[PDB]
Structure formats: C-alpha cells, structure tokens
C-alpha cells in the first residue's frame, strides 16, 4: 500500500513494511 512506515514495537524494533 506504497507509503512505507517503520512501525515500532514500542522500544526499538522497527521494522518497515514499504508496500
């Protein structure tokens, strides 16, 4: 869904799932 955006999981992990 283009728009990427590195969720976190509240502490450090941050993955990014760009489309």
Do not use: S
Request: net charge positive.
């Amino acid at each position: 869904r283009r728009w990427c955006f590195r969720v976190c999981y509240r502490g450090r992990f941050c993955y990014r799932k760009c489309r």
